[PDB]
Symmetry: C2
Subunit: 132 residues, 2 copies
């Protein structure tokens, strides 16, 4: 009985900085380009230092009535002030927010998963309706 799920946390993003917050329309037209914004640290900011940072956000789509989830994408945030001069002396920091664009032809659920280098995995989800 060792499951990854035991170590995927969810919380109210109002209480917890680590929760990825999905911003996506509630209902869209079939095949139109939909913008999905996912942010970690939306209400409570999360640190972005060489030692402590959000590594990535991943988005999944679960089509209603489908048995599976589909990986929409993985969005890696890879600069956190590292330098040959020392940690946090670098020129560039990648913030844990991403806008991805999808085309859907069926209603389903958007699932966001994020990973902190020291605080593990965090998730949220939001239903999305598709129409002609």
């Amino acid at each position: 009985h060792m499951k990854l799920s035991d170590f995927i946390k969810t919380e109210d993003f109002k209480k917890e900085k680590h929760v990825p917050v999905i911003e996506a329309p509630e209902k869209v037209k079939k095949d139109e380009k939909v913008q999905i914004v996912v942010t970690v640290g939306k209400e409570i900011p999360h640190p972005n230092t060489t030692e402590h940072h959000i590594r990535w956000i991943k988005v999944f789509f679960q089509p209603d009535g489908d048995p599976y989830v589909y990986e929409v994408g993985r969005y890696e945030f890879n600069a956190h002030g590292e330098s040959v001069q020392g940690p946090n002396i670098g020129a560039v920091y990648t913030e844990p927010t991403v806008t991805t664009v999808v085309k859907l032809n069926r209603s389903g659920t958007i699932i966001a998963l994020s990973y902190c280098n020291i605080h593990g995995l965090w998730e949220s989800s939001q239903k999305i309706t598709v129409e002609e």
Copy 2:
């Protein structure tokens, strides 16, 4: 004499659908959140099918006067209509456009690299100035 560079192409995105197009401000303030939008198929659309699609966009930052490039991030577009029902029968397509957010403290060059599953690697770049 086998170099990856021999197989990284650049072109005018007006002529070539495969070129990643950077949209970023020309000049920013030190440590403010800067939005960088990168799109493949900005002017000429590129296919998004199970058989033929853009896999990812990667962003690099080259700080002026630094010897190195830094990987800002890798943004994977992972759904292209695959299904147990057959190719291109799936519910979701991830379009090759991404918005990433960075904080810079030095002027440099944004370098975009993209990868098509059948047409290889493509790049573009744009200078960015930082100020107090």
